[PDB]
């Protein structure tokens, strides 16, 4: 007899199980450790091949969208041409010295642009560019001592010489001000909400 149980919805009514008459529709993960080993091995080989260039190109810092992830930060796809021009860089030349370029992204605020311009300048101050011809060194290219003392940044994100994403600092303790003791903010918040909510009906009349 059924007693007091949850009403089941287990969704297993298609031919998913392989048997004598059905091929099935199934996916197992029995190759997971072998694939992990293979990916790490390929990464180390690729680093050795591209030595001394860093394994990963330089990327900008962006803000996450929506009101739920508003306060977070991460790495985006590439630098915008406006940031690159503020840093003094032809995008087509920046593509050849390990900088990612994204022409779709816009800059709607100043602070987001300033952060990425600083990232670009910090990177450019630490670049060590090798000469095309060992005979002749033209303009800002490394001498032979640096080619001797060249190293590879193998970090997982390519942030060795720019650092990780930065965050807004934390407010220090302070005292409560007179107006803060005086009047509440609840009424102000409700007034703004009601103004927007009943806009239109308050204006037609």
């Amino acid at each position: 007899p059924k007693g007091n149980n949850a009403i089941p919805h287990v969704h297993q009514k298609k031919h998913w199980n392989p048997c004598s008459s059905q091929k099935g529709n199934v996916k197992v993960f029995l190759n997971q450790p072998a694939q992990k080993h293979r990916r790490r091995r390929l990464r180390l080989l690729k680093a050795k091949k591209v030595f001394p260039r860093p394994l990963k190109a330089l990327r900008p810092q962006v803000n996450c969208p929506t009101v739920r992830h508003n306060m977070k930060r991460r790495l985006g796809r590439g630098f915008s041409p406006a940031e690159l021009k503020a840093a003094g860089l032809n995008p087509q030349y920046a593509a050849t010295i390990g900088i990612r370029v994204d022409s779709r992204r816009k800059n709607k605020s100043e602070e987001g642009m300033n952060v990425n311009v600083q990232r670009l300048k910090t990177y450019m101050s630490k670049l060590v560019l090798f000469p095309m011809n060992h005979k002749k060194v033209q303009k800002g290219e490394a001498s032979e001592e640096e080619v001797k003392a060249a190293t590879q940044d193998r970090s997982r994100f390519g942030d060795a010489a720019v650092g990780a994403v930065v965050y807004p600092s934390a407010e220090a303790p302070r005292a409560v001000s007179a107006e803060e003791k005086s009047m509440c903010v609840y009424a102000f918040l409700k007034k703004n909400h009601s103004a927007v909510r009943f806009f239109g009906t308050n204006s037609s009349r």
Partner: protein, 144 residues
């Protein structure tokens, strides 16, 4: 493990606990949730009231991110202040500042008695919470 199951205990008992008169047949009641309005009506009505019917307005493309709005109560605020600032805190002096949206909260509710006065920054607040914290000596600052 197979050695702990009831089949091991039933070896030698020909019927395996299903009886001689009524047997262990295939599907004597129908399959799944069949019969919920006809021959399983009593079970459905006694254990799952409300199961059949419609209610309310529709909302075709629901996104949960714009509705994100977690809450925290006044008598739980000490979960967000490190133990060194909490003891130093005192009404009429210097108070720790709590940023709710960085700890994962959007609204401050006013249940209970506040234990450590502080300055709280929040997107939303209830009226009783605002009154209580002002009386205890802190403040609320609206943020976005």
């Amino acid at each position: 493990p197979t050695r702990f199951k009831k089949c091991r205990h039933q070896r030698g008992s020909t019927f395996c606990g299903y009886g001689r008169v009524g047997k262990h047949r295939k599907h004597e009641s129908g399959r799944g949730n069949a019969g919920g309005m006809h021959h399983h009506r009593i079970n459905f009505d006694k254990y799952h009231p409300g199961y059949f019917g419609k209610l309310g307005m529709d909302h075709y493309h629901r996104k949960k991110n714009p509705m994100w709005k977690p809450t925290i109560n006044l008598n739980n605020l000490s979960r967000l202040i490190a133990a060194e600032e909490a003891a130093k805190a005192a009404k009429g002096g210097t108070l720790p500042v709590v940023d709710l949206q960085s700890s994962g909260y959007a609204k401050l509710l006013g249940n209970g008695h506040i234990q450590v006065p502080c300055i709280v920054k929040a997107r939303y607040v209830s009226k009783l919470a605002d009154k209580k914290i002002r009386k205890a000596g802190g403040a609320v600052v609206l943020q976005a």
